[PDB]
Design an enzyme around this catalytic site. Structure first.
Site, PDB file in Angstrom:
ATOM      1  N   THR B   1      12.807  14.629 -50.805  1.00  0.00           N
ATOM      2  CA  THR B   1      12.619  13.352 -51.495  1.00  0.00           C
ATOM      3  C   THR B   1      13.935  12.808 -52.092  1.00  0.00           C
ATOM      4  O   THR B   1      14.811  13.577 -52.489  1.00  0.00           O
ATOM      5  CB  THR B   1      11.508  13.485 -52.565  1.00  0.00           C
ATOM      6  OG1 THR B   1      10.252  13.710 -51.898  1.00  0.00           O
ATOM      7  CG2 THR B   1      11.342  12.188 -53.401  1.00  0.00           C
TER       8      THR B   1
HETATM    9  B1  HUJ Z   1       9.601  15.004 -51.874  1.00  0.00           B
HETATM   10  O1  HUJ Z   1       9.822  15.808 -53.167  1.00  0.00           O
HETATM   11  O2  HUJ Z   1      10.155  15.747 -50.644  1.00  0.00           O
HETATM   12  C1  HUJ Z   1       8.008  14.772 -51.682  1.00  0.00           C
HETATM   13  C2  HUJ Z   1       7.490  13.728 -52.697  1.00  0.00           C
HETATM   14  C3  HUJ Z   1       5.966  13.534 -52.786  1.00  0.00           C
HETATM   15  C4  HUJ Z   1       5.617  12.454 -53.803  1.00  0.00           C
HETATM   16  C5  HUJ Z   1       5.322  13.211 -51.440  1.00  0.00           C
HETATM   17  N1  HUJ Z   1       7.177  15.981 -51.817  1.00  0.00           N
HETATM   18  C6  HUJ Z   1       6.733  16.762 -50.820  1.00  0.00           C
HETATM   19  O3  HUJ Z   1       7.002  16.576 -49.649  1.00  0.00           O
HETATM   20  C7  HUJ Z   1       5.832  17.911 -51.139  1.00  0.00           C
HETATM   21  C8  HUJ Z   1       5.575  19.020 -50.345  1.00  0.00           C
HETATM   22  N2  HUJ Z   1       4.687  19.786 -50.984  1.00  0.00           N
HETATM   23  C9  HUJ Z   1       4.034  21.068 -50.692  1.00  0.00           C
HETATM   24  C10 HUJ Z   1       4.935  22.025 -49.910  1.00  0.00           C
HETATM   25  N3  HUJ Z   1       5.928  22.724 -50.725  1.00  0.00           N
HETATM   26  C11 HUJ Z   1       7.267  22.614 -50.596  1.00  0.00           C
HETATM   27  O4  HUJ Z   1       7.802  21.880 -49.772  1.00  0.00           O
HETATM   28  C12 HUJ Z   1       8.164  23.418 -51.518  1.00  0.00           C
HETATM   29  C13 HUJ Z   1       9.275  24.154 -51.039  1.00  0.00           C
HETATM   30  O5  HUJ Z   1       9.597  24.177 -49.698  1.00  0.00           O
HETATM   31  C14 HUJ Z   1      10.666  23.376 -49.190  1.00  0.00           C
HETATM   32  C15 HUJ Z   1      10.075  24.886 -51.938  1.00  0.00           C
HETATM   33  O6  HUJ Z   1      11.153  25.603 -51.477  1.00  0.00           O
HETATM   34  C16 HUJ Z   1      10.983  26.900 -50.887  1.00  0.00           C
HETATM   35  C17 HUJ Z   1       9.783  24.890 -53.310  1.00  0.00           C
HETATM   36  O7  HUJ Z   1      10.560  25.599 -54.193  1.00  0.00           O
HETATM   37  C18 HUJ Z   1      11.831  25.040 -54.659  1.00  0.00           C
HETATM   38  C19 HUJ Z   1       8.685  24.160 -53.791  1.00  0.00           C
HETATM   39  C20 HUJ Z   1       7.884  23.428 -52.899  1.00  0.00           C
HETATM   40  N4  HUJ Z   1       4.315  19.192 -52.190  1.00  0.00           N
HETATM   41  N5  HUJ Z   1       5.055  17.998 -52.242  1.00  0.00           N
END
Ligand code: HUJ
Ligand code: NA
Ligand code: NA
Ligand code: NA
Lengths: 227, 203, 245, 236, 230, 213, 204, 229, 196
Positions: B1
């Site tokens: 994001t």
């Molecule tokens: B943006 O922050 O990329 C976006 C914004 C939203 C309003 C749509 N958020 C997401 O895409 C998103 C993805 N997820 C669930 C999946 N979890 C993760 O991607 C995640 C990861 O993996 C990359 C990691 O790193 C290992 C962490 O730890 C730092 C946390 C979450 N929820 N929102």
């Protein structure tokens, strides 16, 4: 804990306990409030052997909002403390300070919940809450034991508050409003209908509360007698 | 994001990308990362999507409930404070949430970075999400307080576009709003890759 | 249940609380307890209703209670109710001290108990505490202070006041003789014995204490029966010396 | 009188007057009728209007696909006791994936409504229900009351002037089991207007019908919905 | 002396009985349902010219598509208005939609007999307040009445207060089902002017309407002064 | 130690046309490297104008379907009408988020008809973040199907191609061919293909066969 | 370790018709010294002092909470507290947090206000009392304090002899500990007087 | 339960249930307590209605801990609640402070309990006045505590039937440095004023408190004191 | 990471905080203010974990303001400091422990000026001078060198300059600008922000 129904409806649709709480207001010292442009004012009726400071019936709630009361003085002090708590608790929750309408609505809401919750008789007080909002408009509201609230230009509560409100209804002109001195004179004239035996304080636009001592009060007693 | 926001002469810009990403896989190419609370109040989104959606919808509920009670629209300070309090009550729970609350009120144009920890910062310029850093670079370099409306849109559009170029977890479309004295206006939902192809061809 | 309820926490038709008023009538029978402020101190002087040949005298007082290092109080009413309230006052004083690491200001300690007494008039269906208290103390904000309270949870600050048997007669007598700003503790001790001579004079029936500030620390002490008896004879001689002339 | 105010106070007659006073909430409430055939169960309700300008009061409520009710008494107790039935039905569909037996639902109402008749500072439910429903044991009409008693029925009526309805139904009992749907609804309607005086009778505004059986789920018919059923016999 | 949850021999709760008696003391309010919109009018009953007229909100916005007028105990109403306001935004949160006028009125009707002494956290007595809800949902413009019992019903036209009895007779003659909104607005102010022992003017009353196209609008001094004519 | 989740797998899919909404799924239920059952379709009927696909942990699927079924009634009892497709999708977010700290491991895709009559798909993650879509794949073969749906339904990376809307004839054939391709390459997709078609006339179900290995 | 985060050193000692109590003046956080006049010994009466080593927040909290209870006792009872009673009050106070304890190891030293006979004791973090006829130690330099005390202590010492013993025992112990020192303070409790002195100690 | 006071103020301003409880004490079997210089005495009438009653079974004069003892006039069952509670309060002091509870402090704690039932919900007060003997620093202690929850330290007093006669009898005949030999003899003479019958070792009960704590006197110990009357 | 400093005088207290609001690697705000007005004659300077600092500081602020409204007089610096300590000590062994490091600078009319120190453990220490953060490891020895009890305020700012200049020379974090305020008889006084 005590789950008894204290306040209930009568044969003729009266909440007798709220009506008896309003009789406790009408015995208490005559409190009067007046609005203006630049200034807002409150004043109260009055033994030789007392500290005036301790039996003061004019109380600051926040930096911008204060209040007067009439009725049972113990009951008043709890409403004032819980108002004071809610004023700071409001800032903690949304940063911006309390408008005079919000705190009046809260005191009203608190008074109303005691007329309807189990175990508890109503608060035997009416209050006169005054101050300046976020935008800076002056305000004067009035609550009573039922928990109804209404804004006013000026109002009285306590002993002979009919004869004071009758006097205020006539005398509240645009001439008395204009100046800071003239609004204060109007409050003293109103209290002189029922009444050294006058407590009196003021609030200006950005400034905080300011109680006038008996030396400052007796200055305005001379300025009234000329007219 | 990647989200960004900056104040200038003619109010406040607010631009976000649209990529959602479960791991390296792209969950969704076009997600709306701005909430429209009322005509005079927006909210950007970054971090966990469900936390962002739920808690900013709950802000909106309380902002709508503030309008009905008080008979006046909520301030940007109060709204930003109210969201940070929701985050403060759920501290240590692993909520991930990186909003900026943009609006206009009696106090002027307002912008607040609000965070999962309880952080709550009033400021002229902010950026959040994984592409945070890349957005700042372009934004800060081409910034002036006295931009035109079109030059402001060019800055916000470019800053998200160059962030999505570098950051793996940002992409899709730039969704740019513009706050004014008479409420927000949606500027554009421009595709990022078409903009990056356009800037390549300019050299 | 509803039939057996006394209903202590209600307004009567007039607009007033019956059990609060009826508790103040209990105080009007109890012993004459008074207090007098001065420039260099504060005093409390009380009628000693525990008076018999066979009473032991364990404690340093009978009606007087210390609360904090800089504070004390005396009572009038049901003594058992006073033991509850005084214990709670002491708890409040230390609760403040634990929190801020300063002594509790005198008005704050009185409001804290008076908020509790008011609760027994408003809710819980419980009878109020049938005690009026007279408090004395020093703090850094207002200095030498005297307060009165009563079963309603209402308090006031006084220069001089009285509660108990012949309450009103004692206050009107104090309204004559008290001079505001001009009274010392020696002159106040004379007036205390003058008023108790009207209302109630052996030293077993009287009980006095004096709060003063000596060398940056508050000094609370009961008077012994040698100190009281010499002050009684000074009143008897001053009363008799005026009678001749 | 001494034994009138509290539900816990037994009278010297061996009666609890607060139950019997709560029964009068049903009687002064409007008329409604319920009956069953071999295949269906029908509820018919005379909807009382407040003034002639105001729309008519909703007297037949939905509980499940297989159960619905008609009410008579205090509307808040009706809605509270309706939601209890709706929830216990929902529990059974959640837990067992199978509709709750009507007799078992009715037993839980009796168990629930009895509780406050024995406890101080509480009151009986000021509402009587006629409960239409179909299950593995075919169609049922059950009655419930403020007293917490419940009755399995061939048919029943309750409300204002409902003695007239009960007299009609007690004559035509053996007819009901053999009737088709249209004849069974018409029987329930004739029982209802017997409660009314000779001056006023059934219209599409002041009548509601509630039907469940083997084919059909608990459907409710109010306005133009009702027009098919009334147009058959209308004299006296 | 007896409990709050006590039936009379007639078969009804004394405190509910006496809560209906409390609405007679309250100031009168009228609402008329029309195909083009629901209007709502109420008397302020101003006891002094010192009292600010604009701070007697007896008609209020529940949502952008619903209003509610009140009579009786004004303080008791504000608890119920806030609970309705909460309910609508709780519904918006969960379902991303507006509530019906019936659904809002039902939610408030569920609170009517939620009082009692033993087995409680909770209310001692009922709310001594009649509410006239009025809004526009997917089923056209709807007006709904509620009383202290919890009984709620749709109304073509209805009034509540001191001259509820008197005003309902005037509504019977004046009301026609195919009329316009502007006729229904002026009907109310005619019927209010008669029953008020004070004289009708822009400061002395509140009017408010809800149409299909337009939101909840409460009428200003200038907008009331234009209608005043009739 | 005790693990409360397990991966049962399967794929789900939904498409929104101008006058329709497809919601389809496989029928394989797995655990480890064994097949539990071959007749466990992931499509669940809610209302006449709305159907939901649910894949992942099957214990949560059964419960969450039963929750939605229970809540549909509770709404209809309160409001005297069926829930709209958009209102179900909004409600589902709150149910999934109410278990934010102990997730319903269920990838949900709702598909049906909005209040304006047209097709409407709503895709989800386990904790309740959602959006409206034209199309979305989910479950085991989400990664396989989604980019082909991006290509053929979204017209992505194609030029001199007229952006014509999806006929129900064409979309049904696409859903068959993608689930054939998933069944080949995914171990957890197979056996048979449930396809629910939501139009204004109602719901109707087909069952094409897939690879049984 | 938890006790060694702030560190500190406290000691008490007996003589003929007198008791001594002493402690270092360092408040620090791990490596960093913060201030050099931090109070570890607190009065609990005229001829009765309590010394508190270890975790500084709990040193202050236990002192304050003990004073709370002390003042309630003295008002209720109408007297000064006996030394053996104060030990049990601390023991009760600390054992109330048995499974979540205050990280401090108290050392009490006073004369009995009736008889004026010497009393000393110390308690562990969970409030187990230990009365001795010689000395008690508590701090990060307990081992160092024991070795000085054991060798230097003699019975029946006069007020001037006690001061020199307890001071040299503290000074040399805290000079072999990194997280104790920055001054020493010593109170000589006698019948007639309390003689508090601060020593010319090492400031490293 | 009932969450409201049964004891309330009348228009005169008197807590009527406390004065009615004092009538229950005043009409109880009489009890006497005397403070000598070297000790404390507690004595009472234990005249049950028949010779059928086992005299060794239940006791009026009861210990609280090894250095404090107790006796009453008025209600017997109410008394037993206060004994059990006082015994707990003694241990709750000893556990905390590791010192024998002061007699003043035990009375203050039991007074607070006696006060509790003149205010708290759905309960009458106790129909009992207690007499509490003890030994603290190195000297005797005697205290009364009556239904109000008020307490008075006495040199000597009487309770129950003919308490007015016992109190005046004691006033003139008590000396402020009596021997404990003499005080035990005085306590029995105070009871013999109010008695109806011939006295014995069985039909009265006496306990004493001194240097070596509190104990109840044996029948034979009482019989020696009864021999010279 | 953040940095606080206080220097008590004979009749005043100088204080200063940095103005970086940091996030990950980015300096989100150059103009951030870390001082909180408790009373007219008291400042609470607060540093620590991101959300913990403001939530704690503001909870104390409002209760200090509540004490003013309730009683008609403000808390003393001693009273305010022990109040701050009491809250942080009670949270320490609980579900919500606030990781906050803070200085409470003030002026009493009777007792004169006072600078208090407190770590996240809630150990309260009155000091003639003190500092928080990694910057304190560099700057505390400069205060040992040049501080005297009779230091004038204009000299005390030049002492402060040497500490803040040492952070620019040696401390690896940026910290370009600093807030500066004095408290005395006449309450709180803003001063020019020491930029570079
Ligand atoms: B943006 O922050 O990329 C976006 C914004 C939203 C309003 C749509 N958020 C997401 O895409 C998103 C993805 N997820 C669930 C999946 N979890 C993760 O991607 C995640 C990861 O993996 C990359 C990691 O790193 C290992 C962490 O730890 C730092 C946390 C979450 N929820 N929102
Ligand atoms: Na496969
Ligand atoms: Na050292
Ligand atoms: Na060193």
């Amino acid at each position: 804990s005590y789950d008894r129904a204290i306040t209930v409806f009568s044969p003729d649709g009266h909440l007798f306990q709220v009506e008896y709480a309003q009789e406790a207001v009408k015995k208490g010292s005559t409190a009067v409030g007046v609005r203006g442009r630049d200034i807002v004012v409150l004043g109260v009726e009055k033994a030789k052997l007392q500290d005036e400071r301790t039996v003061r019936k004019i109380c600051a709630l926040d930096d911008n909002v204060c209040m007067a009361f009439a009725g049972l003085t113990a009951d008043a002090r709890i409403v004032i403390n819980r108002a004071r708590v809610e004023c700071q608790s409001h800032r903690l929750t949304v940063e911006d300070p309390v408008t005079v309408e919000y705190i009046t609505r809260y005191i009203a809401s608190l008074k109303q919940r005691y007329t309807q919750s189990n175990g508890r008789r109503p608060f035997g007080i009416s209050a006169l809450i005054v101050g300046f909002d976020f935008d800076g408009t002056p305000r004067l509201y009035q609550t009573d034991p039922s928990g109804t609230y209404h804004a006013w230009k000026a109002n009285a509560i306590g002993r002979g508050a009919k004869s004071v409100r009758e006097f205020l209804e006539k005398n509240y002109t645009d001439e008395a409003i204009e100046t800071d001195d003239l609004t204060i004179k109007l409050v003293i004239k109103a209290l002189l209908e029922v009444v050294k035996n006058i407590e009196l304080a003021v609030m200006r636009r950005d400034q905080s509360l300011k109680i006038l001592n008996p030396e400052e009060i007796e200055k305005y007693v001379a300025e009234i007698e000329k007219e | 994001t990647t989200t960004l926001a900056f104040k200038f002469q003619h109010g406040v810009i607010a631009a976000v990308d649209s990529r959602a990403s479960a791991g390296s896989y792209i969950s969704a190419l076009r997600v709306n990362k701005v909430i429209e609370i009322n005509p005079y109040l927006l909210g950007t989104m970054s971090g966990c999507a469900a936390d962002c959606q739920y808690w900013e919808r709950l802000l909106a509920k309380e902002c709508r409930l503030y309008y009905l009670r008080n008979g006046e629209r909520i301030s940007v300070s109060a709204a930003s404070k109210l969201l940070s309090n929701m985050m403060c009550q759920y501290r240590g729970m692993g909520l991930s949430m990186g909003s900026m609350i943009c609006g206009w009120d009696k106090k002027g144009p307002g912008l607040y970075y609000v965070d999962e920890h309880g952080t709550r910062l009033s400021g002229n310029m902010f950026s959040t999400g994984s592409g945070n850093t890349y957005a700042y670079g372009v934004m800060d370099s081409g910034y002036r307080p006295n931009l035109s409306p079109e030059e402001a849109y060019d800055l916000g559009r470019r800053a998200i576009a160059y962030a999505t170029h570098r950051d793996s977890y940002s992409g899709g479309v730039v969704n740019m709003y513009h706050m004014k004295e008479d409420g927000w206006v949606k500027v554009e939902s421009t595709d990022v890759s078409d903009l990056l192809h356009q800037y390549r061809e300019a050299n | 249940s509803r039939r057996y309820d006394s209903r202590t926490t209600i307004f009567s038709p007039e607009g007033r609380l019956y059990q609060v008023e009826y508790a103040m009538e209990a105080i009007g029978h109890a012993g004459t307890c008074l207090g007098i402020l001065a420039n260099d101190g504060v005093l409390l002087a009380a009628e000693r209703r525990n008076i018999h040949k066979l009473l032991d005298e364990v404690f340093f007082s009978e009606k007087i209670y210390k609360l904090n290092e800089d504070m004390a109080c005396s009572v009038a009413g049901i003594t058992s109710d006073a033991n509850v309230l005084t214990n709670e006052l002491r708890l409040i004083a230390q609760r403040y001290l634990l929190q801020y690491q300063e002594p509790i200001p005198c008005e704050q300690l009185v409001t804290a108990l008076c908020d509790i007494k008011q609760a027994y008039t408003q809710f819980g269906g419980k009878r109020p505490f049938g005690v009026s208290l007279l408090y004395i103390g020093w703090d850094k904000h207002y200095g030498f202070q005297l307060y009165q309270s009563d079963p309603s949870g209402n308090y006031g600050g006084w220069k001089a006041t009285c509660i108990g048997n012949n309450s009103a007669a004692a206050v009107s007598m104090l309204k004559q003789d008290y001079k505001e700003g001009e009274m010392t503790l020696k002159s106040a001790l004379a007036l205390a014995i003058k008023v108790l001579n009207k209302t109630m004079l052996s030293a077993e029936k009287v009980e006095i204490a004096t709060l003063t500030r000596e060398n940056g620390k508050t000094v609370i002490r009961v008077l012994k029966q040698k100190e009281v008896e010499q002050l009684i004879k000074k009143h008897e001689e001053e009363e008799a010396k005026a009678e001749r002339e | 009188n001494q034994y009138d105010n509290d539900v816990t106070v037994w009278s010297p007659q061996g009666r609890i007057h607060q139950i019997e006073y709560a029964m009068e909430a049903v009687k002064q409430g409007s008329a409604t009728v319920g009956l069953k055939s071999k295949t269906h169960a029908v509820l018919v309700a005379l909807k009382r209007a407040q003034s002639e300008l105001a729309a008519h009061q909703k007297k037949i409520l939905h509980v499940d696909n297989h159960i619905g009710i008609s009410i008579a008494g205090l509307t808040a107790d009706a809605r509270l006791l309706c939601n209890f039935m709706r929830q216990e039905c929902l529990d059974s569909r959640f837990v067992f994936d199978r509709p709750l037996p009507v007799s078992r639902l009715v037993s839980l109402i009796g168990s629930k409504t009895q509780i406050p008749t024995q406890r101080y500072g509480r009151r009986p439910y000021g509402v009587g229900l006629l409960i239409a429903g179909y299950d593995d044991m075919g169609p049922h009409i059950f009655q419930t009351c403020p007293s917490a008693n419940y009755f399995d029925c061939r048919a029943m009526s309750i409300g204002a002037r409902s003695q007239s309805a009960r007299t009609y139904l007690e004559r035509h009992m053996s007819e009901f089991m053999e009737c088709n749907l249209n004849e069974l609804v018409k029987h329930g309607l004739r029982a209802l207007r017997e409660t009314l005086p000779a001056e006023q009778d059934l219209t599409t505004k002041n009548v509601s019908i509630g039907i469940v059986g083997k084919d059909l789920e608990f459907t409710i018919y109010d306005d133009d919905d009702v027009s098919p059923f009334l147009e058959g016999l209308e004299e006296r | 002396d007896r409990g709050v949850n006590t039936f009379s021999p007639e078969g009804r709760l004394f405190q509910v009985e006496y809560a209906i008696e409390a609405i007679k003391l309250g100031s009168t309010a009228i609402g008329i349902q029309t195909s083009e919109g629901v209007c709502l009018a109420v008397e302020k009953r101003i006891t002094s010219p010192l009292m600010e007229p604009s701070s007697i909100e007896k008609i209020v916005e529940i949502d952008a598509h619903i209003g509610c007028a009140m009579s009786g105990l004004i303080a008791d109403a504000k608890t119920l208005i806030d609970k309705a306001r909460v309910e609508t935004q709780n519904h918006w949160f969960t379902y991303n939609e507006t509530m019906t006028v019936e659904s809002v009125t039902q939610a408030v009707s569920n609170l009517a007999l939620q009082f009692g002494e033993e087995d409680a956290d909770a209310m001692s007595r009922p709310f001594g307040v009649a509410l006239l809800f009025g809004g526009v949902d997917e089923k056209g413009p709807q007006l709904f009445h509620m009383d202290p019992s919890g009984t709620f019903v749709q109304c073509d036209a209805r009034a509540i207060g001191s001259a509820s009895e008197g005003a309902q007779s005037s509504l019977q003659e004046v009301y026609h089902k195919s009329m316009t909104l502007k006729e229904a607005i002026k009907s109310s102010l005619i019927i209010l002017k008669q029953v008020m022992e004070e004289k009708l003017n822009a400061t002395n009353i509140e009017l408010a309407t809800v149409q299909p196209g337009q939101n909840f609008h409460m009428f200003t001094k200038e907008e009331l002064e234009e209608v005043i004519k009739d | 130690r005790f693990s409360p989740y397990v991966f049962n797998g399967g794929t789900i899919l939904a498409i929104a046309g101008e006058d329709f909404a497809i919601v389809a799924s496989d029928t394989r239920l797995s655990e480890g490297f064994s097949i539990h059952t071959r007749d466990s379709p992931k499509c669940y009927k809610l209302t006449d104008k709305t159907v939901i696909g649910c894949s992942g942990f099957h214990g949560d699927c059964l419960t969450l379907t039963k929750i939605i079924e229970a809540r549909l009634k509770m709404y209809k009892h309160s409001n005297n009408k069926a829930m709209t497709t958009g209102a179900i999708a909004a409600m589902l977010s709150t149910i999934l988020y109410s278990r934010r700290f102990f997730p319903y491991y269920v990838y949900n895709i709702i598909g049906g008809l909005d209040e304006e009559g047209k097709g409407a798909v709503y895709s989800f993650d386990p904790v309740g973040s959602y959006q409206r879509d034209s199309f979305k794949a989910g479950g085991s073969a989400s990664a396989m199907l989604q980019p082909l749906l991006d290509n053929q339904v979204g017209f992505k990376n194609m030029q001199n191609v007229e952006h014509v809307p999806l006929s129900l004839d064409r979309a049904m054939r696409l859903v068959k061919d993608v689930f054939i391709s998933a069944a080949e390459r995914d171990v957890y997709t197979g056996d048979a293909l449930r396809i629910c078609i939501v139009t204004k006339e109602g719901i109707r179900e087909e069952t094409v066969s897939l690879r049984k290995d | 370790s938890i006790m060694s985060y702030n560190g500190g050193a406290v000691m008490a000692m007996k003589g003929k018709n007198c008791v001594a109590i002493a402690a270092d003046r360092r408040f620090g956080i791990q490596a960093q010294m913060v201030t050099t006049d931090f109070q570890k010994i607190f009065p609990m009466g005229d001829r009765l002092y309590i010394g508190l080593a270890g975790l500084a927040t709990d040193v202050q909290t236990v002192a304050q909470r003990l004073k709370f209870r002390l003042n309630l006792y003295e008002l209720k009872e109408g007297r000064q507290i006996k030394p053996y009673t104060l030990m049990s009050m601390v023991a009760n106070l600390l054992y109330e947090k048995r499974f979540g304890p205050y990280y401090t190891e108290p050392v009490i030293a006073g004369l009995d206000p009736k008889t004026f006979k010497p009393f000393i004791c110390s308690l562990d973090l969970i409030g187990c009392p230990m009365v001795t006829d010689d000395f008690v130690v508590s701090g990060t330099c307990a081992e160092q304090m024991y070795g000085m005390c054991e060798s230097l202590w003699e019975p029946n010492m006069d007020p001037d002899h006690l001061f020199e013993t307890i001071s040299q025992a503290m000074l040399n112990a805290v000079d072999r500990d990194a997280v104790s020192g920055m001054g020493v303070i010593v109170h000589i409790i006698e019948k007639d007087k309390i003689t508090t002195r601060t020593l010319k100690a090492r400031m490293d | 339960g009932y969450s409201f006071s049964l004891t309330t103020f009348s228009p005169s301003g008197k807590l009527v249930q406390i004065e009615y409880a004092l009538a229950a004490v005043a009409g109880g079997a009489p009890s006497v307590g005397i403070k000598a210089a070297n000790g404390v005495v507690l004595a009472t009438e234990k005249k049950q209605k028949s010779i059928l009653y086992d005299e060794r079974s239940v006791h009026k004069v009861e210990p609280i801990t090894k250095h404090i003892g107790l006796v009453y006039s008025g209600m017997g069952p109410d008394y037993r609640v206060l004994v059990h509670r006082a015994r707990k309060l003694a241990q709750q002091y000893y556990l905390v402070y590791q010192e024998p509870i002061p007699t003043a402090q035990l009375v203050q704690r039991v007074a607070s309990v006696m006060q509790e039932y003149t205010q708290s919900g759905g309960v009458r007060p106790f129909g009992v006045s207690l007499l509490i003997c003890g030994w603290n620093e190195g000297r005797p202690y005697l205290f009364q505590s009556d239904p109000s929850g008020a307490y008075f330290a006495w040199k000597a007093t009487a309770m129950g039937k003919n308490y007015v006669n016992g109190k005046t009898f004691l006033e003139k005949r008590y000396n402020e440095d009596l021997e404990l030999e003499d005080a035990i003899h005085t306590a029995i003479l105070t009871l013999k004023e109010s008695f109806e019958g011939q006295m014995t070792e069985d039909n009265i009960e006496v306990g004493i408190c001194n240097e070596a704590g509190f104990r109840r006197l044996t029948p034979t110990e009482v019989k020696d004191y009864l021999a010279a009357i | 990471m953040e940095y606080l400093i206080g220097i008590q005088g004979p009749d005043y207290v100088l204080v200063a905080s940095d103005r970086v609001a940091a996030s990950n690697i980015v300096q989100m705000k150059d103009d951030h203010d870390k001082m909180f007005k408790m009373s007219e004659k008291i400042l609470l300077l607060c540093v620590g974990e991101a959300g913990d600092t403001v939530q704690f500081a503001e909870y104390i602020q409002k209760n200090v303001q509540l004490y003013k409204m309730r009683n008609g007089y403000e808390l003393s610096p001693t009273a305010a400091a022990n109040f701050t300590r009491r809250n942080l000590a009670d949270c320490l062994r609980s579900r919500t422990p606030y990781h906050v490091n803070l200085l409470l600078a003030g002026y009493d009319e009777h007792e004169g000026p006072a600078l208090y120190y407190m770590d996240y453990l809630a150990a309260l220490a009155k000091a003639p001078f003190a500092a928080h953060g990694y910057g304190a490891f560099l700057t505390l020895s400069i205060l040992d060198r040049y501080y005297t009890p009779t230091i004038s305020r204009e000299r005390a700012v030049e002492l402060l300059r040497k500490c803040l200049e040492e952070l620019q020379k040696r401390f690896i974090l940026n910290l370009p600008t600093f807030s500066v305020r004095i408290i005395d008889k006449n309450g709180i006084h803003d001063l020019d922000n020491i930029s570079f």
